[PDB]
Ligand binder design. Structure first.
Ligand SMILES: O=c1[nH]c(=O)n([C@@H]2O[C@H](COP(=O)(O)O)[C@@H](O)[C@H]2O)cc1Br
Ligand SMILES: O=c1[nH]c(=O)n([C@@H]2O[C@H](COP(=O)(O)O)[C@@H](O)[C@H]2O)cc1Br
Lengths: 258, 258
């Protein structure tokens, strides 16, 4: 027991391939920053992934908000992910019975599993939601994140709900590689912690979003990666905002490491 | 709460325009059956909507599972919904912060808000999920169903969670027209209750789904509408299957009505 670096956690015996790949590039590029690319145009998604790719360890998408999505766009995006070295995380939020989610994960127009290294899912439906996705994810060598806590005001992902998420992730470690949470929720270093609702300044938006700083999230709460969207995208200089958040989240990591 | 027919509730006080339309056609056509058209081909989706249109009060879709989705398909589905008289419910299960769900509800390739009469949402993110959807749905006279309970084993949608779902619906009655539950969770007659996990049996699938009969859900549990998928879809003759479920659920309703 003791805080292990990202690089050491990447080699843990019970580490998942996807999580190991991420941890390795995080340490290599000194970034634990996940950019939330919430844009409506592919060329916009592709432009941002290329420009900020060197500053991030992951790019989170909402492919269903893209007005001109095509599988050729995802092909191009993967080329950028391979080039700049970052994973692709489709924030799809699987939250239905197992029989429906495996279909939403593999088929349809998006064919998410064909290009998403990671996807997340709400635990509210019971473990069937993980077992259904699994059937599609394991063959494709993918990983899954369980939403244990949420950043929004009024969130019901608390107490027993949060504990249920942890037990579910620890019982499906062959596919679940971590959590979407506001702080460390598992004491097993094989699990990744990704925290959204992050900005340098205090505040939030008028539709429920609440913000905490990188030092608070990574340093005081023990999470691993910060997910930032508007904090970077609405800034006049997006590359400088990216670096600021990268250095913010990385230095907080280093401090907690000792 | 004495037991009122669908035709009476449709003329109720705080009754939302959509809920009113739906209850009126239910009474007219003698059907409180919602078809879960879980198929991957637009051609099959449309053919089922045409043949089963007269037997249903609603058609539930999972557009992200349609391999060949286009807005022209929805255009034709709408023509059918108007012809046979049934609402179109997209089981999108919105479950993110408001700023995000409003984009996923309005834009992307699906532009759900443009053709969906109803959509549902998980309450785990907090009321903010309802607020974002509301900004898009209110002017279009759309409605929202809150997922208070779930049909799958291990569901976390219970106790206080379900209570929180009801409070939220009652706090946004201007847009929230009902619930997705296994039974009556609200005593306010203006609120609809739709129940999935239904088959003439009482059984389940290998991925968490659990089944109960129309008599049990509608009659004993006090729900309004049954959402049936495989119990009809897997049949050789789906129309005969739909008619079977229609009479089952209507008679279950006529029984508690007294
Ligand atoms: O609890 C959560 N909070 C979140 O903010 N998110 C996503 O993280 C992103 C945060 O974006 P923001 O612009 O930094 O507020 C956005 O795409 C959300 O949908 C997702 C979950 Br799950
Ligand atoms: O709690 C729930 N249970 C459900 O089964 N559903 C949907 O209802 C449908 C039921 O299909 P079935 O084939 O009758 O099991 C299916 O599309 C589900 O995604 C939706 C909710 Br919300």
């Amino acid at each position: 027991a003791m805080e292990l670096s990202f690089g050491a956690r990447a080699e843990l015996p019970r580490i998942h391939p996807v999580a190991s790949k991420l941890l390795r590039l995080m340490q290599k590029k000194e970034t634990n920053l996940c950019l939330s690319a919430d844009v409506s145009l592919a060329r916009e998604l592709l432009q941002l992934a290329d420009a900020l790719g060197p500053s991030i360890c992951m790019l989170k998408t909402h492919v269903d908000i893209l007005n001109d999505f095509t599988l050729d766009v995802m092909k191009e995006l993967i080329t950028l992910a391979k080039c700049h070295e970052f994973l692709i995380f489709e924030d799809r939020k699987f939250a239905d019975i197992g029989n429906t989610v495996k279909k939403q994960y593999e088929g349809g127009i998006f064919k998410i599993a064909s290009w998403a290294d990671l996807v997340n899912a709400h635990v509210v439906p019971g473990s069937g939601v993980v077992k259904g996705l699994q059937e599609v994810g394991l063959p494709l060598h993918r990983g899954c994140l369980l939403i244990a806590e949420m950043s929004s005001t009024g969130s019901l992902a608390t107490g027993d709900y949060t504990r249920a998420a942890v037990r579910m992730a620890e019982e499906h470690s062959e596919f679940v590689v971590g959590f979407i949470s506001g702080s460390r929720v598992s004491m097993k270093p094989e699990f990744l912690h990704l925290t959204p609702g992050v900005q340098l300044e205090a505040g939030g938006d008028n539709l429920g979003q609440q913000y905490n700083s990188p030092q608070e999230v990574i340093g005081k709460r023990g999470s691993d990666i910060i997910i930032v969207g508007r904090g970077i995208i609405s800034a006049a200089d997006r590359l400088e905002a990216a670096e600021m958040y990268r250095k913010a989240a990385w230095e907080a990591y280093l401090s907690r490491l000792g």
